[PDB]
Amino acid sequence: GAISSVLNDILSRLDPPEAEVQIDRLITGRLQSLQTYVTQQLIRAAEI
Amino acid sequence: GAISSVLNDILSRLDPPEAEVQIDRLITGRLQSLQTYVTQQLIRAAEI
Amino acid sequence: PAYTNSFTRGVYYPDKVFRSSVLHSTQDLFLPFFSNVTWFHNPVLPFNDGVYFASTEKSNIIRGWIFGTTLDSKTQSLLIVNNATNVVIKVCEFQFCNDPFNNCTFEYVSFKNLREFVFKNYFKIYSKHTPINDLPQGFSALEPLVDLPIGINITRFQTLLAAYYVGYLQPRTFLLKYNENGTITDAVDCALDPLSETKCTLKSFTVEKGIYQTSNFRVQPTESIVRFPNITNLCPFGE
Amino acid sequence: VFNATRFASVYAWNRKRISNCVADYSVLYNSASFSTFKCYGVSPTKLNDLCFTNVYADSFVIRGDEVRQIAPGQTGKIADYNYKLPDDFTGCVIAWNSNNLDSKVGGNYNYLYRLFRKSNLKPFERDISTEIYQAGSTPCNGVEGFNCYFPLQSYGFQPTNGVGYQPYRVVVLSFELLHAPATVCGPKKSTNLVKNKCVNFNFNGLTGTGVLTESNKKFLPFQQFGRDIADTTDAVRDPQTL
Amino acid sequence: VQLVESGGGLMQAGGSLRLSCAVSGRTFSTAAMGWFRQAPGKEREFVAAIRWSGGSAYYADSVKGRFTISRDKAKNTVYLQMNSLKYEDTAVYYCARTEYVSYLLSDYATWPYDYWGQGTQVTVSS
Ligand SMILES: *[C@@H]1O[C@H](CO)[C@@H](O[C@@H]2O[C@H](CO)[C@@H](O)[C@H](O)[C@H]2NC(C)=O)[C@H](O)[C@H]1NC(C)=O
Ligand SMILES: *[C@@H]1O[C@H](CO)[C@@H](O[C@@H]2O[C@H](CO)[C@@H](O)[C@H](O)[C@H]2NC(C)=O)[C@H](O)[C@H]1NC(C)=O
Ligand SMILES: *[C@@H]1O[C@H](CO)[C@@H](O[C@@H]2O[C@H](CO)[C@@H](O)[C@H](O)[C@H]2NC(C)=O)[C@H](O)[C@H]1NC(C)=O
Ligand SMILES: *[C@@H]1O[C@H](CO)[C@@H](O)[C@H](O)[C@H]1NC(C)=O
Ligand SMILES: *[C@@H]1O[C@H](CO)[C@@H](O)[C@H](O)[C@H]1NC(C)=O
Ligand SMILES: *[C@@H]1O[C@H](CO)[C@@H](O)[C@H](O)[C@H]1NC(C)=O
Ligand SMILES: *[C@@H]1O[C@H](CO)[C@@H](O)[C@H](O)[C@H]1NC(C)=O
């Protein structure tokens, strides 16, 4: 839901006030992605 | 991302219109944290 | 120019918070443990960061400091003088001697002797006084004494007269141990050595045997490269 | 600060420190004398119930259309080269038209602004230097000419100028929301202390609910209050009593 | 605020004269001082300007290499050193002052000034 996938692009075009919001969206997304990955691996490891 | 890690501080500094936003950030954060804790406990309980 | 050892000296209470039997990790300006303190028995010293001053006294010879960018009449410079009764601290543009032995808005009035001070930036002064048997072996915390909201620019300082030592603070992460009574009893410099990194990671003073992942090694880029296609087909500015 | 005879130029904005006093903020937020009254990370009403170690009133003058540049993370000549607010600013910005005072027949040129600088200012940085700006590759050596300009320029303040170009007086209140002893409080009155009961307490703005008991903690003469493991307040020092 | 001019008068061609202009009365600030001249029946014409801060000077082409403008901040006085005088230099010379700060020194050649002196005659003879 951010303006771009690349952090550098946001940094270099959007100024900090708006850039911060976009980066917050990007952070939230990947942090959720990492959490999902970890959870799945935990369950997979239990099985193994 | 909120202006403080305390809730009363926000309530004692801002009006509802914006304390809402800050509190939303705090709630999101902590609810995510609780979900993580419970998830970890679930599989730990499985192995036990 | 002599070098002796800052074994564990340069520890002060970071803020006004009271903490008991809890280990607290803080990023602040603390003197490096086990670095060098230059030894002098009066030279001009630049105040780059906070400075650690440590005086070994026989007869209380030294009792004053000047703290100013140029230490001269033209800009207002901080001047602190003790004479065993009152600590006269003034911030005016005072004409200062070649060898010292107005517009002053702010004003305040109050080897066995080891006196340790930390001065940092407005202005903050911590200190501690102890009896001693060239820099003593051990550990002790400095309680804050003064907070001057003067906002005076200070990039250089001098002493006003006995041995003393000078150290320079650095922004280093420390782990501090608070005892039953909230007194600081031990510390760890999280960047001194790999063992200390381990201690700081675990938030403990006791690492039991094992292998611990502490940090992440990463090569830094040395330079920036920018490439674009050859310049051509100018705009018709000539026209 | 508000009733000051003269104001400072934006490039050399004045700073007044406020300490050790009671602040009746009503006189400001009840007054109708102000066009812009914008408070960040604080509501004015609540200021009556709050204490601070220090307050900074930064005073200066700009033209109307640049008042928007007095805000966190704005860009332009003012916010870049004259007076920069931090992105995490916590305080109030008050601005009101001063055409009746700062403008005169023929144009008031006493008020300046910095037009050139080699980099943007840091928050609350003050640059009063008059060095010749080297716009090009040729050193100026303090000599004005081609690509060598004086960094400052005057404001054209005439009574007939558009509201956009008319002079506006600006006051910026910043608060020291540190944990340290607070000397700047609001008008709110104090009461008696009740021990060994569940109460809704407020100590110098630190609000909470709990039971207040005489402690045995070996607090130091300077230590204001204490916390437990969870980063929550556990013990305090009475503002009125040691 | 008054601008009080002095010096000048009669001098033979090739000679040098110095004009002074003292600023009296309470000033908030001075941006720049200038000299202008008006020859009989002709338009008043820019001669030289000096920025109060820094002392950078700007000259009409007709006086370059011949005239020097200078300032004494403490005395609130501007000077025009008029060397290598020519008949063409005969005119009433006027001191001018402004509080207008332009980034661009050359603006002082064309800026309408706020304050004017009474004028001092310079007459260059054979
Ligand atoms: C404090 O005043 C001094 C006066 O010179 C200034 O610091 C100088 O800063 C420049 C810019 O980097 C350096 O090249 C000089 O080395 C500094 N001078 C000295 C004496 O160290 C500046 O106006 C102020 N500096 C600070 C820290 O605010
Ligand atoms: C230390 O020097 C100061 C310089 O005057 C003296 O401190 C004064 O103490 C007297 C007595 O109370 C006060 O009336 C003055 O206001 C103080 N002056 C200032 C500016 O501090 C004092 O004479 C000296 N103390 C000694 C000799 O022990
Ligand atoms: C906290 O303070 C108490 C009170 O002073 C300390 O208890 C004393 O300990 C010393 C030596 O450590 C003894 O001489 C005293 O007899 C003790 N006093 C009492 C009342 O028992 C205690 O050591 C301090 N805690 C720490 C670890 O700093
Ligand atoms: C000891 O002194 C040497 C000689 O200059 C210096 O390089 C070094 O920093 C000092 N060692 C320490 C870390 O105390
Ligand atoms: C004190 O302030 C006045 C007012 O600006 C100034 O004229 C004077 O130079 C200052 N004193 C010193 C020695 O800096
Ligand atoms: C005009 O021609 C001259 C001489 O060839 C050259 O220096 C200049 O760059 C030209 N102008 C433009 C705008 O191209
Ligand atoms: C005011 O505060 C002081 C603190 O030193 C205290 O001694 C005094 O009793 C207080 N006065 C009242 C009436 O609260």
Coordinates of N, CA, C and O in Angstrom, one line a residue, chain C residues 47 49-54 64-65 67 78 80 116-127 142 157 167 169:
Chain C
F47 N 37.7 21.1 24.3 CA 36.5 20.3 24.8 C 35.8 19.7 23.5 O 35.0 20.5 23.0
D49 N 34.2 16.6 23.2 CA 33.0 16.0 23.8 C 33.0 16.4 25.2 O 33.8 17.2 25.6
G50 N 32.2 15.7 26.1 CA 32.3 15.9 27.5 C 33.7 15.6 27.9 O 34.4 14.8 27.3
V51 N 34.2 16.2 29.0 CA 35.5 15.9 29.5 C 35.5 15.3 30.9 O 34.7 15.8 31.7
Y52 N 36.4 14.4 31.2 CA 36.6 13.8 32.5 C 37.8 14.4 33.2 O 38.9 14.4 32.6
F53 N 37.6 15.1 34.4 CA 38.7 15.7 35.1 C 38.9 14.9 36.4 O 37.9 14.7 37.1
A54 N 40.1 14.6 36.7 CA 40.4 13.8 37.9 C 41.6 14.4 38.6 O 42.7 14.3 38.2
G64 N 39.7 25.7 40.0 CA 38.9 26.5 39.1 C 39.1 26.0 37.6 O 40.0 25.2 37.3
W65 N 38.1 26.4 36.8 CA 38.1 26.0 35.4 C 37.6 27.2 34.5 O 36.7 27.9 35.0
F67 N 35.8 27.6 30.7 CA 35.2 26.8 29.6 C 34.6 27.8 28.6 O 33.5 28.3 28.7
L78 N 32.5 30.6 30.3 CA 32.2 30.1 31.7 C 33.4 30.1 32.6 O 34.5 29.7 32.2
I80 N 34.5 29.1 36.6 CA 34.2 28.5 37.9 C 35.4 28.6 38.8 O 36.5 28.2 38.4
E116 N 37.0 13.6 41.4 CA 36.6 13.3 40.0 C 35.4 14.0 39.6 O 34.4 14.0 40.3
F117 N 35.5 14.7 38.4 CA 34.4 15.5 37.9 C 34.1 15.1 36.5 O 35.0 14.7 35.7
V118 N 32.9 15.2 36.0 CA 32.5 15.1 34.6 C 31.7 16.4 34.3 O 30.7 16.7 34.9
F119 N 32.1 17.0 33.2 CA 31.5 18.2 32.6 C 31.0 17.9 31.2 O 31.8 17.4 30.4
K120 N 29.8 18.1 31.0 CA 29.2 17.8 29.7 C 28.1 18.7 29.3 O 27.6 19.5 30.1
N121 N 27.7 18.7 28.0 CA 26.6 19.4 27.5 C 25.6 18.5 26.7 O 24.6 19.0 26.2
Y122 N 23.0 22.7 27.2 CA 23.5 23.5 28.4 C 24.6 22.7 29.1 O 25.2 21.8 28.6
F123 N 24.8 23.0 30.4 CA 25.9 22.5 31.2 C 25.5 21.5 32.3 O 24.5 21.8 33.1
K124 N 26.2 20.4 32.5 CA 26.0 19.4 33.5 C 27.3 19.0 34.2 O 28.2 18.7 33.5
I125 N 27.3 19.0 35.5 CA 28.5 18.8 36.3 C 28.2 17.7 37.3 O 27.4 17.9 38.3
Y126 N 28.8 16.5 37.2 CA 28.8 15.5 38.2 C 30.2 15.4 38.9 O 31.2 15.8 38.3
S127 N 30.2 14.9 40.1 CA 31.5 14.9 40.9 C 31.4 13.8 41.9 O 30.3 13.3 42.3
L142 N 29.6 8.7 40.2 CA 29.6 10.1 40.4 C 28.1 10.6 40.5 O 27.3 10.3 39.6
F157 N 38.9 24.5 26.9 CA 38.8 24.9 28.3 C 40.3 24.9 28.9 O 41.2 24.4 28.3
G167 N 40.4 13.0 30.6 CA 39.8 12.1 29.7 C 38.7 12.7 28.9 O 38.1 13.7 29.3
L169 N 35.0 12.0 26.9 CA 33.9 11.1 26.9 C 33.6 10.7 25.4 O 34.0 11.4 24.5

